[PDB]
Amino acid sequence: FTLIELMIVVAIIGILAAIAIPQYQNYVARSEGASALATINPLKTTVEESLSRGIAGSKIKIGTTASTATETYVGVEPDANKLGVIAVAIEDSGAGDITFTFQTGTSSPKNATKVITLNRTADGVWACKSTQDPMFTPKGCDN
Amino acid sequence: FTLIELMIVVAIIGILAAIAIPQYQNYVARSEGASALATINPLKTTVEESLSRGIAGSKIKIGTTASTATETYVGVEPDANKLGVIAVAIEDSGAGDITFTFQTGTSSPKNATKVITLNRTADGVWACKSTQDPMFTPKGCDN
Amino acid sequence: FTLIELMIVVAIIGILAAIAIPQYQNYVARSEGASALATINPLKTTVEESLSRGIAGSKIKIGTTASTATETYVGVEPDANKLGVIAVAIEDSGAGDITFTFQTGTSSPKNATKVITLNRTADGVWACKSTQDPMFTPKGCDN
C-alpha cells in the first residue's frame, strides 16, 4: 500500500459524499389525501340508496353488523383505513355529512388533525370541503 | 520510503476503519409485505365478478388453463411470486379466503412461515388479517 | 539512518501487503439484471393500452417518431440502455414478445449474449423467461 491510493480513495469518498437530496414530503401529503377521498366517496351511493328506498335517516350507520329490511350498515369499519377515522350521521330530514378525520398516530405531520367532509343539503345537493392546505387538497373540493 | 509516510498511512487506515453501519433488515421486511399485498389484492375483483355473474364458487381456481363459460381461472400461477405461495378456495356459499404463505427458501428470516389472508364473509364483507409483526404489517390490515 | 528503521519499514510493508480481496463479480452480474427488467418491464402497460384501445398489433414499434391516432411509438430508443438492445414485435393476433438482448461490448462477461423475454399468450396472460444463470436471474422469472 502507498499514500497515492489512500489519498485518491479519501478524495473519491468526499466526492461521492456530495449528492443532493430534494424534498419528499408533499408527495406523501398528497397521496394521503388522494386515498382518503377515494375511500370515503363511495358511501354516497349507499346513502342515496337508503334515502330513496324508503327507510329514514339516523338508522344509517357504519360497521359490520349485517343488514335487514329497516336499518342499513355499509360494510366498512369506522377505522378500516389506518390513516384516519370515518363518521356518518344522517339526520331525519335527509340532510347529513360524512366526515373523515385524520389521526395523529398514523397520518403525516402536515395532514394531522385535518378533516374532510361531504355534506348533503336538505333539497338534495352534494358538496364537499376540507381543512388541508391548498396544494394538498384534491382536485374535487375547496378549502 | 521513510517511516513517517508508512505510519501516517497506517493511522489513516485505522481511521477509515471506523465507519458505523446502521440496521437494514426492517427495510426488506417491510418491502416484502408491501409487495405481497400489492400482488394478492387484485384477485378480489375476479372473485367478486365470478360470484356476481352467475357461476358458483369452488370452480374458481388459479393457474393458466384458459377459461370458459362455467369455470374461471385467474391468469396467475400459484407460485408466480417467488416470495411465497398463493391459495384460493371459495366455498359454494360464497364465503372464502385468499391466503399468501411466505416460503422459507426465498422470503426473509423475519417474514418466514408467515401468512396473510383476505376473507369474505357470507353476507358479503371483505376483511383481512396477517401473522407478521406489528411494525411489518401493512397499513391496511390488523394482526 | 540506521538498519533497524529500514528493516522495520520493510517488515511493515510486507505485513500490509497481505490484505485479502473477496469476489466482486456476482454483484455487478446481479445489478445488470436488476436494471434490465426494471427498464424493460413498463412497456407492458403501453402494449396493453394499445391492444385494448382499438388499434391492432404489428404497428406497435419503438423509437421516437411522435404518435398519431393509428400507430403507437413508446418513447424509448431501441438502444436507450447501453447495456443491451430491446426488441418488440406484437403479432396481429395480439400474441407477442418483448425481448432484451445483452450486448458483448458493454455488458459483463457472464451476462454476455444473454436474452430476457416477456411473452403474451393469445388469451391474454403475461409470462417471462430468461437464459441467465439461476443465481443471476431476478426474483420474478424462471430459467
d(CA A82, CA A127): 25
Does the beta carbon of A66 lie under 8 angstroms from any beta carbon of chain B? yes
Residue of A nearest to C14 (CA): A1
**Cα C16 to Cα A4, B25, C95, distances in angstroms:** 15, 34, 61
Phi/psi at A13 (5° precision): -60, -50
- Give SS3 for A123: coil
d(CA A111, CA A32): 8
Name the experimental technique. Answer: cryo-EM
d(CA C60, CA C47): 8
User: What H or E segment, with its residue span, contains residue A140?
Assistant: none
Pairwise CB contact (< 8 Å): B125 & A1: no
- Give SS3 for B35: helix
User: What H or E segment, with its residue span, contains residue C122?
Assistant: none
Pairwise CB contact (< 8 Å): B123 & A66: yes
Contact A98, A76 (CB under 8 A): no
**Cell digits for B77?**
400461477
d(CA A139, CA C19): 61
**Cell digits for A120?**
348533503
User: What H or E segment, with its residue span, contains residue B71?
Assistant: none
How many residues are given for chain A? 143
Nearest by CB to C9, from B6, B66, B81: name it. Answer: B6
Pairwise CB contact (< 8 Å): B1 & C16: no
Phi/psi at C5 (5° precision): -60, -45
Q: What is the DSSP letter of A50?
A: H
**Cell digits for A8?**
485518491
Nearest by CB to B75, from C5, C13, C125: name it. Answer: C125
Contact B8, A3 (CB under 8 A): yes
d(CA C57, CA C140): 26
Please list the residues that pair with A98 across neighbouring strands.
A88, A118
Contact C36, C81 (CB under 8 A): yes
Q: What is the DSSP letter of C124?
A: S
Contact B120, A71 (CB under 8 A): no
Residues of B in contact with C125 (CB under 8 A): 64, 75
Residues of C in contact with B82 (CB under 8 A): 139-140
Pairwise CB contact (< 8 Å): C13 & B1: yes
Rounded to 10 degrees, the C-alpha dihedral C128/C131/C135/C136 comes to -80
What is the residue type of B128? C
Residues of A in contact with B134 (CB under 8 A): none
Please calculate the CA angle C37-C42-C46 and round it to the nearest 5 degrees. 145
Rounded to 10 degrees, the C-alpha dihedral B64/B66/B70/B73 comes to 20
Does the beta carbon of A1 lie under 8 angstroms from any beta carbon of chain C? yes
Phi/psi at C19 (5° precision): -70, 130
What lies within 8 Å, CB to CB, of C60 at 6+ separation is C46, C47, C50, C71, C72, C74, C88, C90
Nearest by CB to B82, from C126, C127, C139: name it. Answer: C139
User: What H or E segment, with its residue span, contains residue C100?
Assistant: strand C96-102
Mutation pick from B82, B103, B106, B107 vs chain C, by most beta carbons of C within 10 Å, is B82
**Cell digits for A124?**
338534495
d(CA B76, CA C125): 8
Does the beta carbon of B104 lie under 8 angstroms from any beta carbon of chain C? no
User: What H or E segment, with its residue span, contains residue B32?
Assistant: helix B26-40
Question: This structure's resolution (angstroms)?
Answer: 3.6
